[model samples]
Target: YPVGWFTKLPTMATRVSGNPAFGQEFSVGVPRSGDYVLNAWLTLKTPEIKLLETNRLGANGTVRWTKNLMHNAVEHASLTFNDICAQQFNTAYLDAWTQFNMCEGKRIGYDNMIGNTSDMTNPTPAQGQDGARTLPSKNLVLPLPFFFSRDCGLALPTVVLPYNEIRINIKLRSLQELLVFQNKDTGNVIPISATDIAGGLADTVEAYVYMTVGLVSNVERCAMAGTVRDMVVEQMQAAPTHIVNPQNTNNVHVDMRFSHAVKALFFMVQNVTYKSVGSNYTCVTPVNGPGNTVMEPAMSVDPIKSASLTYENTTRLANMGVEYYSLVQPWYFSASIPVYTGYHMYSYALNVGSVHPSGSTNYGRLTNASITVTMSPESVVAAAGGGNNNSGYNEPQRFALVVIAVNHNVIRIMNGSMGFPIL
Candidate 1:
């Protein structure tokens, strides 16, 4: 039978001795005009039931295998085989229509690389590549002669299909979902019977088949698939990059690096508070210095009369919170002051009174602030200076962010000590 874009190849059985591993390499030509979806599965055989480790299933319980799709020698995609005996299981399939209309695949609406169809009836490929074929009524049914010839006459009903030909499929819809299975028992190797169709086949060899989906241009498709692997590596390698606080504020300036670059960084501010003491007023001015004086504002501007201070300058204080974003080397980002400090000061009515037994009035100011910054990194395509006309963003989930603290006192009260008097 002629298959549209799907290619299937059979692999040699890996020997149970010493747990030796094996693989198969096959050629798949992408169509010149569009893209294609690739699906592959592995078939297992045994003379008798021998307990072995399996994918998603428990040890000495059911033998399972993990399939990895490699392109040009690089692993692009991977999925664990699901046992057919399970009454219900989830499969991954692509949505063809959604992928074609994307802004060159920037935000694949939802699932660009991952998605699941509701069932066999609604077998739609979420993203479009070349031409995707509708699945058979039963997903496990195999087309004849796609690979080596089979013993046609000996086949058994629906059970006639090869035993344990669990397959992996792909979808291109904006939304993607993954289905995985697991087994709890982890014991020693067990035995099986070949007469048993449930993972117990006598003396027969098993084969592994690899299927993949790619665009017309092999270069593009391979690159696309590689992104999935890259992102996984990036996340796995992600650790607490760094930490910063008022005392170690300079620590925030440190540069960051990622295996896949950084997609984004989050800054969490906690317990940030500062206060002003006494009637001797101090005006904080923006000053960029270094070391102990680094970011310390220049001392007081001419003090405005405590009571006569117009609130005009007070409004200007609203912009005091430090903020920044960048697509540069240092890649670090930060906000100097707590965003809520200014809001808190202005939202309340100000009052001044004499609390001294000697008729001396004490003036004071207080601010409590907390802020957060979510920074996204430049696209890998954009960073590489890939021009505006590219087909996709090639934005890897891997990227790093630089955390910065503008200065010690981001909150600059206009007329220091007298505080926000009344109005």
Candidate 2:
């Protein structure tokens, strides 16, 4: 029997004071009374390392170098409370945030099922690129997808369920790190001397904490598959094709092709700008029928039914220390094409023929384009005579109940409301 479909609840975030005594509490209530999977983490601000360069006469009649330092040099902090029913916080703080464990490895594949037993010591690529924190201290690991077992093995399915209530109380405890300086005469590095600077110099902590709550399910009878970050760059040889032709007569069409059995599709375009004029465009589904042919007005493409596309040209450039640019708006189209199989196609036909004269020159081009097709794979269990025990619930299901879960936790925090339902 297929498990269940994932549904998102809400999210919440708050800035807690660095003071250990006055920790902050983050709470999120269930949107629906159904089961849910809860995930939470905290983002701590990198403590600034204050440094003071010094030069002084040494005993050898040469110049000696020393430095003064301040700030929380300790590369660690912790959340005092992470559980309910008066759960004591200790090594659990370290265990909660570390990303990779040494022994088990990542994922529940056959190669390294034991999983990483040790904590992840390094920052991920995204974290390394972020200038917000030092590389060493940026090792805070976020939650990962849960698995049934820790050891390496095959046929391990993901755990999908929701929690009744989720709450996280966080506190930051300061750790100290000594500043290091170099000794000119000895040609060696040493800790900063206490006598080299004045008193009352110490570092403080500040951070932005993030928390999320979501829902997930793993239906046994179906599998979810899709394109992995598909990308396309359409280049115009000389004149860019006007997706929206102002002249009403001539038509232009762009075709995006893929080979697969699709149940649903999501199409989006980014960085679509115009040189002279700004016009709107619409997108439609690719040609579908027998013999895999292309046809005009094939079927009503759900999600994207000739969806209107818009472009803006405000503050899109950085100049004179005033980097201004309108946010790149990505037009999205989604629809469910039930009982569809074989070659898939997407059509972006221009309606310029309705607005301007035939053969109009003014138009916009897509700088970045992406499309994701949710593949509908055959169910292994249903094919092998493994049917659900509940006869009333079975209604000759065609499409798998695969869906992308959404989290409204952040929205709940911003609006001070429960949240909207996810389709």
Candidate 3:
């Protein structure tokens, strides 16, 4: 956990196999072979909810907003885990190299040796490096004790924790609400709900990130851990790294590679409520008073709940092969809002509506604002070796959109090392 000054970016290289430090996870296998390029850079930080007014009439104001801070998103997942690596460890290159290294051991990246040991350009180590045909800047850890150990117990020893690339960032801290979930008579008020608290340590700490090269495999690692590893490790371990860097320049690098702290503490609220019986106003009930039987009027403002905690499993790495190339469920991290005025209701129940379908139709549909990122495969033979074959020819759910952004705010900030490479 050294290399300060933000370590000049591109980090993630802790270590931690049998123990040399304080380990949680660490991976580097490297033998699937061919077509590889992984990149990950997710930055997020949003927390601060303060908005009070309870309805008006009597008045009690104080609305401050801030949820979705620098919603940065990135995912450029590619494939070919072993389309044909000299034909050795078949099984479709061990099922796209275990569905793109599905969290076998706290994953990391190339780090320094920078390239070349064999397999052409080098850069392959999500589980390779045993006897070594070549490539071994550090032998990349070797799938940490055969995948997160647990056969028994004591042997307990993991300590790499060095640092190089794993640096997720965030900072939104600026939102407050208290309208008491309004909607009494169209008074309108509702907005406050966004909470993320898993960035580095609540207890089970184990984050081995290094995704890029089109997100490679685990159906794109649980669609990038439900979109950008749960919002850049919940906004860099839940806020407050040091301060003064941009304001002046102090803490210098921070540590853990370049800048490692991690955060997660969010909120966005604004509510207005009002419910009645019915008359056509649509509250629809039975009796009201005498005969007119009328009593309907409603108003809304939502934000009751919003959650995030993705460690991304995708069915335990699709049994160890990786599948689900598509069919929905790959969101390296997403959030959407705003059809503008056409239809907008987002209190955080995940109501992202973007309709644009009417003609052309190639892979189009989504109006105003919407985001998508997918992948699922923990094993079905690693989801049929990447293609997800039901023997159906290989549609693997075929849906494609690589990258598309239309924003206003619903919850977005995916960053698989900053990608948007279409095909």
Candidate 4:
């Protein structure tokens, strides 16, 4: 029989502020006296931004509201059981955005799921035009891509032990990071920084995590006090950002340390100009900015001269272009077209457990890996249109790189009171 499901707030703090000058956290506990199923949601309030008029001709600052809230809000997220961090995704802001773009048609990830504000009239890579702040504070609810959340979709109902303590920790990003405002035209958009607004908008706005849980009755929970001993975990992580100088090094290299069965590997690239969350950036957006990061050069195979993955001195993948990559992995062809490329992303999937680790162990166990991406001159920033040399548009433009990988892990339970990782 199914138990009644309802939402619960974090035990540590119901809400934390979105201030840029201060640190924020939301630590949620996932244990009741009874066994339960778990799903998590994040709630945040929009900031009141003061748009100062500028010289950029006829630009409506009210349109600065961007759906990028989901990807730009949190700095890091992790799930821990018995003090073992089973999954930790750093730069979760970009990872969430890239993960959404990986699929075709993006059947979800708008509004309450990822982005903020209700206005969807904007074009691809949606930018909400509600910068007008129709209300003083607007609350937003979005789902968290936690390991249990992913496990729920792929496998059987994971009955969590009622006694073990599970914690979901979210380290919030600064308030000024509310971004995706493109070019630096005088009247263009900007982050919700202290310089732009008065007191209490970012510092007092509430943010927290709520979980929808199946509250098992005592009768059913008694039978499984210590019976459940282990569960499979999907650990996703993003290596630190790498700045790629297209002119100096067409060949880019990054070394990531991992000790798990790798399920997949992928990466994203964007221009360094007008990069989000950059405090040094006085203005947002690049020239002719009509789109979000997706609109930027994703460095997918389109601009990639070559791509390679080498682990333990063994060459795993070494290929590029439509014919070779698409042929070698047919699904890559299917997943690349509209959703991935339309959003300027190129992802490579490893045949680890065939995307179904349900009792399979065919995934690659990585000891050490060094991934590289070679870009054509096309990956470099283009000259300013109309030869606008006055703006230094002709300068060498660099693109920042973010590498993402997914792997499998196991969490072994003892006494149903604690859990430890077998990674």
Which ten-residue region of model 3 has the weakest summed lDDT?
Answer: 337-346
lDDT of 4 at 214: 48
CA-only RMSD, every prediction: 29.3, 27.9, 26.1, 7.0
For model 3, what is the alpha-carbon lDDT of residue 359?
A: 22
Worst 10 residues of 2 by lDDT: 321-330
| lDDT: the better of candidates 1 and 2 | 2
List candidate 2 segments past 4 Å from native: 1-35, 48-87, 92-166, 179-203, 216-423
Best by lDDT: 4
Instruction: Kindly report which residue stretches of model 1 are placed more than 4 angstroms away from their true locations once superposed.
Output: 1-27, 33-75, 78-137, 140-197, 202-256, 259-261, 265-423
Q: 1-423, model 1: which lDDT tens digit per residue?
A: 943653333332222212212223222221112232233333322122323222122122222211111100111122211232211111110111122112233223233122222221112121111111221111221111111122322211111122223432221111100001111111232233221122333232233333333233343444532232100011111122332321211122233332221222222221101111001111121110000110112112101101111121232223221221111211222211211100111111111111212211112121212222222222233222221122112212112221211110011122222121220
Question: Which tens-of-lDDT digit does each residue in 271-328 have in candidate 2?
Answer: 1111000111111111110101111221221111122112132232123110001111
Q: What lDDT tens digits, residue by residue, belong to model 3 across residues 192-236?
A: 322121111111112243332221233433443344321111111
lDDT of 2 at 77: 25
Q: Is candidate 2 or candidate 3 better by TM-score?
A: 2
- Candidate 4 residues 49-73, lDDT tens each? 4443222323333333233554455
TM-score of each: 0.18, 0.25, 0.16, 0.65
Off by over 4 Å in 4: 1-23, 29-31, 48-67, 92-106, 109-113, 116-120, 126-137, 150-163, 175-204, 241-244, 270-305, 311-318, 322-368, 376-400, 416-423
